[PDB]
Every structure is written in structure tokens, then in C-alpha cells.
Design a protein around this ligand. Structure first.
Ligand SMILES: [Cl-]
Ligand SMILES: [Cl-]
Ligand SMILES: [Cl-]
Ligand SMILES: [Cl-]
Ligand SMILES: [Cl-]
Ligand SMILES: [Cl-]
Ligand code: NA
Lengths: 268, 255, 256, 250
């Protein structure tokens, strides 16, 4: 099943879409500057791009870390991003009451992994009728995603993206099961699957030392996921991977994606 | 560090405290019946007791599933439990705005495991000044519980209980690392550690074996659910065993 | 099901049996001294005791680490232990050809975890007719132990002990699933289940070994398997006092 | 570091090599038939090929299960495969005494994962001087492969292949950590790394293809694989391998 996002077609048989941006919105000027870097690199390669940021992030690593400019100013920033660059945008919500006003502006709304079973939020997000990105909790098996999808369907919204972010592996933070992508596609009606490679490399479960040198293998992880035929890649980059590297990185991802997406799926 | 909850002393070198009750509040009358059973059993066995129930199941599998009586009616039920039996109670909170009104009634308020990183919720719970029960996420290493404890300390509340509920073990399965208890005690200032045996068994006579094993490591409390979950009529027999072990362990000097 | 090992009764409802000793037989005099310390302490506390050591350790940290005294001299050392102290002994085997000569001397023979699905070794061990200790591999689940037990039964030997040593948990780490003991008892005919606390900790000390040991023994087990040099040898008495306390309590109550 | 196996170059920047065949050798005729199929498919696609089989099934579910032809007859069959098809072969060894006679015939000898810490087996395999395929244990972090490599080096054999076969994930289940390939390359001197997709897989056809594609995207020396399913698979794997190998390393 494909999802149309303005001009973009998002789907597991379509050219991959890049989701990226900044962690939290600070100001119009800082946002436009960072967005412009992604837009310039993606335009150089012809890759569809959706800008991501949080306006009120409730799960930062300290309780006084800045949560973002907030709903009213955040939406004004997102409006300007859409107008200036002509791209769609994506943000997370965590309060049911925020869903409707966010959905007036933001093309895709995101269901934080920790909240993925929270019924009042699921309903409120569903009722917006917007595209929704469902983050797969690290503690949920891929064959359980169908239950979250079922709740969205019960609440009347089928425009759903499934977002892989890794699975809990010992006290070693996260491992990504490359088979989980296929399990999701098969059980959830071939909804668009996207791969959050950045959060798959998170180390808040066990601390950074428990991940050893393994996180340096991030291009590899991205390539490996995209080899399984995916609608998109969710990826953070700042001058997260560095920006001199972003073009080189996307060249490799686009090469693989183009190769994969050009071949018919295996005969049956 | 010990925590006083009314007349109860909760701590890792004190007689274990039972946090027991039910999944979800469904009516006044069923709640009082179940709680009466727990009170009568625990009083005769001499086991300190805190009554547990959720007022809302916020993450059931269908949007049409029964969620329980809800906040307003749930607090009325908890007020009646406290009046009738004179015991403390515990319930979970899911939204920052629920924290102050829940804390006015419920002695202990509980941070759900999946919400343990929600900073707005941590702050709102902390501000209540109530005793807090921190459910350890299945995806968190025991040496990282300190990170949650640090947030509560920064928010000005140190009356914290650490609650084991198992660790993810592959897909759809949990294991309880019996060494984690000691890791939590050493790295979190010997705050009370309690064991949620019920949720640790998320896919028998297995509950007793697992409870015994956890309590062998010397813990402040046991957290469990029954249904009229352990069959309610087996409660007394179950607790006799747990108390026999707890008494023995607690009588041995710490090494 | 109980197993008699000389005058010892091993079983999940009997007083726990300590299986203790050392990693690798490296000498005669030092072996006897260490064994003597275990004997003195277990006799003082009334705890049944079986001395454990490897004669050939195929597991070493370097290619030229000493592998141990070997079969012939190792069996001689075991003979001396048995003559001097009058206790049973246990050791591991790695090759079918070693089964007979080791079984003639040793009261229990051990199947290494890595070899637990090696059919030729299983058959050769079964055919000795000796008591066998089956080490549960860290990569095998507790409900698969019944398949190893079946192979021994097909080969004619039912005098089997199941030994827990933890399960793989992420990378380079072990966790002991306290529920596995019950799964093994239920699916394998209530054969004796013992807990190798030493090897269950090898990726993680004294206070840890105690907590883990107590936790396991709370589940009602036939025995505890440990190495010293590994627990410091002088702390053996204190450690066993606490284990025996819990074991006596548990074992004195009927099963629920 | 590349390894030459006859006229095959095996390395992490070379065209991938297919290791495949059958589980356990049962007869000459069925072995030659299966091998001929792999040869015909790999030749027409231009993929280097090494034939794999065990002479013995060391783990069977019953004591009375069929065990395979055994060492003596197994080596006679491997000799005939090499004479008929002119390809290298690979088999596993389980006992030190088997190492020298197997190495006389088999180009690559394999260290089973469960036996990777058996020091006497390592030494005996090293002393053959043959190319060795080291199967990574399901509990070991990829950085710990360096400790096994060190042992082989100290025993005088540097012709080593590291082989991924998945990692234990709870009970009775495996996961392949796609980050581990790079870790093994970086910590073990860029020895060839190959991916045992068959044993990593605790329809199922489509799963094997997804997993194989994902691992080969990390840039590997080779792969193990068990109406024309082999060729359809290989066509896709070769397409991806060729693309990956044509990009400079980042
Ligand atoms: Cl903080
Ligand atoms: Cl998560
Ligand atoms: Cl709960
Ligand atoms: Cl959890
Ligand atoms: Cl041992
Ligand atoms: Cl093992
Ligand atoms: Na004997």
C-alpha cells in the first residue's frame, strides 16, 4: 500500500524517502539553516525529503533539557519550512489534545514508541486523518505491530507508516532484525516500512560502553536495511552522522535503493 | 535507605512488604471483597500490606476493551479502602495532570515502565512529594536505573522504590536477572527494591518458585496480583512460604 | 527421581549436595590440600560432598596454557582423593575413548555443554552405566534438555543429572532463568537438577555468587556446583552456612 | 587480506564466493548430482563456487538416525567431486585426529561454532596449513573473534575466514547483527568474512533472500546458501554484490 504525501509517493516499491532534521525546534532561523542543508543535499541527488523536528519533546535525557519552542511557535516554524522549501514535514505528538492543531500543519504525525499502545493518543491521532508514523517499540516483536495497526483501523485511519528502531538485545542496547521488516510487511498489509537507523544506534538502555565499537558501522546498517526493500530511511545529520559525509552516505543508499527497487519482487 | 509509609517501614533489611491486589478497579464491592481477603490474610501472618489496583488500563489491545472505572470513580474507591481498612494504597499514573489529584488520595504513586523516560510525568510525580514506585523497564539494564533515580532527585523527591519486572529476552519473553537486584541496591543508594513477580511472568507453580528466588536476594517487598495473576484462595499458602524464606534471609547478617 | 552416589542420595527433595573443587588438576599435593579444606568444612556442617576437577581442560585462554595433568595421572590423583577422603568424585570427558577408563574411577562423569548434542559421546557415556552430569548449553533452552535425556535413555542409561550454567544474554553475557529449573524438572521426569553458579557468573564477586546461589536453591534443587581457587577457598564455610540454611528451610516444607 | 583458493580470490573487496552444497554426504551419485546443479548455475552467472558437505552428522535427534557416509567414504566422495568438477571443497571437522587426513583432500576445513574454544582442535586445524573457516559462536560479540584469530596465528596459520551464523536471541531463536561484519573486519585484520545465511535462519524462501541481501550489503567475501530458486536468488545477490564492490570504501 502506498501513501501519497503531497507530491511524494511513499511505499515499499517506490524510491526511498529520506526523513531527517533536528532534534528539537529552537527558532525559525536555526531551523531553516539546518533544513536547507538537507534540502540542498537531497536535491543534488533527486531524493524525496521530509523534514523532522520536535516542537515539544517529552523524553529527553534530562528533565531540564530544552523541550522545544512549543506548539504555537513550532507550528509557525513548520509553516515557514513548508512554504520556503515546498517539502512535507513530520513531528511527534504525545498529548491527545495536541493532535488536531498539529495536523492542520504537519503532513505526518508521529506516535512515540513508548506510547504506541496508549489508547487515548492512538484514537486522537487517528481522528486527525493525517498520515501517521508508528514507531516500533524496542520491546515489541515485529508480529505485534499488527495490533497497533488494528487500533488505528478501529479508530478510522489506514494511512500508516511502520518505523523500525531496533530491538532490545541483552543489556547491549539494540540489535536490528533484518527479518522483522518482512514480518511487518506480511502481517500489516504491506504498509510503508521505514528504518530509523539513528535510533537503532541509541545507548540509553545499557550506556554507551555496552555498544563497544559497533555504532561506527552505521552506513552498513542503513545499507543492510534498505537491501530488504523499504519505503524510507530516518536519519539525523549535523556538521548523528556529519554533513560532509551526508552526500556520500546518500549516494550509497540511493545506489542500492535504485538497484533493489528496479527489480521485481521474487517469483511465486 | 528505608521509607516510612504510614506505620510501615519499607527497606531492604526490613520484613518484606506485600504490594498486592488486582489488575484494574471494576466496582466498589468487588474491590472491598478482594482487599478484605488480602487484609485478613496479611494481618494474621503479620505481613505489612499495601493494596494495589489500576483505575484505568490505558494500553489494552482494542479501543473498545473495558478500561476499568476511571480516575474519578477510582479515587472514590481508594478513599473507601483506606477508610475501611486503614492501609496504604498504590496506583499507577499515566498523565502529568493526574498526579496531584491521585496523590491526594493514594499513598504510593507508580511510574509505568513504558513511561519511565517521560520527563513531564517524572516532574509531575516528583512534585507531589508522595512515595513513588519506579517500574524498571524490561529494556533497561539494572546499572541504568540510576538514571531514572537521578531525574527524580533533580525534581526534588528521594522517596523512591525500585521495582523489578523482568528483562526482555528475545521476542515476546522475559527473564529475571537475579543479579540485578544487588546492582540496583549498589548503584542507587540502597533504596528499597521490590519484585513484581506477576508481570515478570508475561509469557503456574512458577510464580512461587520465581518469587522465592527473588526474595532470596534480600528485598524490601513483593508485588503481586490475584484474581477471584495468582488464584486468590492460594494467597495464604503462597505467603506462608514467602514469609518463611524472608524471615530466614532477613535473620542472616549481611555479608 | 533420586540417584544414589555411594552413600549420598541426590535428588530435588533431598539435602543439597555440593559438587566442588577446582578448575584443572595441576598437581597432587595442592589438590589434596584443597580437597581437604572442602572435606573439613562439609563434614563440619553435615553437607554431602563430591570433589570436582578436570584432568584435561580443552577450554583454555591460550593454546599453550597448561591443559592439566591428563588422563592417566588425573585418574591416579582421583584415586588418591577417594582413598584418602572416602568421597565421590566427578570429572568431565571430551572423547568417546575416554569414557571407560574415566568411568572406572570417577563416580560421576560429565558431558561438557559444547558436546551435549554429540551423539557418539552421548552413546559412549550412556554405555558406561555410570551416573552422568549433563551440562545445559548456554544456547539451549530448558525444554530442549528432554531431547538429550531421551538419547541417553535410548542408549540405556537413566542415571542422569541436569546442570544449569546460565543462558546467553546479548553478547558475552549470561543470565540464569530461575524458571528453567522447573521446566527441566517437569519435562525430564524430575531427574536431579544442580546449579553451576561458578560458570553462571563467568561473565560478570563473592556477594554475587551468594545472591545467585541462594536464588537458585530457593527453587528446590538437588545440588550446587562450584569452583574455588571462582570463590575464595577460606570463605567456603560462611558461604555454605547460608546455603544450607536456605536449603534446609525449603526442603523441610512440602512442595506447593 | 585476500586468500587464494586455487584460481579463486576470496576477499572482502573481491566478487563474492558462493559456498554451498548439502547437509550430509549420503552417496556418491546424489552428491555429484547436487554439485553439478550448483556448478551449472554458478558458471552461467559467473560466480566462484566452493562445494560444501559434512561427512558426518555429529548431532542427530535419535541414536538410530542416519549419520552420513563417514570420514573414509566421505573423503573418497570429495576426491571425485574435485576430479570431476575442478572446484575446491569445504567440510567441517570435529576431532583433532580427523584434521590431517581431511586436509589432505579438502581445500577448506571448518571449525564448528560450538567447538571454537576447543584449543586442541584449533591447534590441529592450524597445523594442517589449510585455509580454515572459523564459524562464530552464537554467544560471542563480533570483537571477540580476534581472540580465536590470535590462537590460530600463534599456532602458525593465518589463512583464516570468519563466518557469521547469527547470535542467540532469547530461547530457540537467532538474530544477525549487521553491525558485526564491520567489527570483525576492523578488529581481525580484514580477513575474509562470509555469511552462513542457512544456519542463521533458525515464505521462508523470501526470508533467506532478504537476509542474504542485507548481509551482502555490508561488503563481504562470500555467502553460504542451500522452480529455479538457486539461480533466482543468485542473480539478485550478484547484482547487489557487484554494485557494492564497485563503490569505494567509506
Ligand atoms: Cl535530570
Ligand atoms: Cl522503544
Ligand atoms: Cl502494575
Ligand atoms: Cl517494560
Ligand atoms: Cl565444569
Ligand atoms: Cl555453553
Ligand atoms: Na564410576
Amino acid at each position: 500500500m502506498d501513501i501519497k504525501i503531497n507530491d511524494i509517493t511513499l511505499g515499499n516499491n517506490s524510491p526511498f524517502v529520506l526523513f531527517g532534521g533536528i532534534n528539537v525546534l529552537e527558532s525559525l532561523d536555526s531551523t531553516l539553516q539546518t533544513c536547507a542543508h538537507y534540502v540542498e543535499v537531497t536535491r543534488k541527488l533527486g531524493i524525496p525529503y521530509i523534514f523532522k523536528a520536535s516542537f515539544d519533546k517529552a523524553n529527553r535525557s534530562s528533565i531540564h533539557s530544552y523541550r522545544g519552542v512549543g506548539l504555537e511557535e513550532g507550528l509557525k516554524i513548520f509553516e515557514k519550512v513548508k512554504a520556503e522549501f515546498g517539502i512535507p514535514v513530520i513531528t511527534d505528538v504525545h498529548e491527545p489534545h495536541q493532535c488536531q492543531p498539529v495536523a492542520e500543519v504537519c503532513d505526518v504525525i508521529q506516535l512515540p514508541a513508548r506510547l504506541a499502545r496508549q489508547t487515548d493518543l492512538v484514537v486522537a491521532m487517528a481522528k486527525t486523518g493525517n498520515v501517521v508514523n508508528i514507531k516500533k517499540p524496542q520491546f515489541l516483536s515485529p508480529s505485534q505491530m499488527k495490533n497497533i495497526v488494528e487500533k488505528f483501523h478501529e479508530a478510522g485511519n489506514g494511512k500508516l507508516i511502520l518505523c523500525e528502531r531496533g530491538s532490545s538485545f541483552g543489556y547491549d542496547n539494540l540489535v536490528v532484525d533484518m527479518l522483522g521488516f518482512g514480518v511487518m510487511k506480511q502481517t500489516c498489509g504491506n504498509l510503508p516500512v521505514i528504518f530509523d537507523v539513528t535510533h537503532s544506534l541509541q545507548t540509553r538502555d545499557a550506556g554507551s560502553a555496552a555498544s563497544g565499537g559497533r555504532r561506527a558501522q552505521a552506513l552498513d546498517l542503513a545499507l543492510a536495511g534498505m537491501a530488504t526493500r523499504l519505503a524510507g530511511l530516518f536519519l539525523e545529520s549535523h556538521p548523528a552522522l556529519p554533513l560532509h559525509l551526508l552526500e556520500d552516505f546518500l549516494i550509497r543508499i540511493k545506489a542500492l535503493d535504485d538497484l533493489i527497487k528496479s527489480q521485481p519482487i521474487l517469483t511465486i
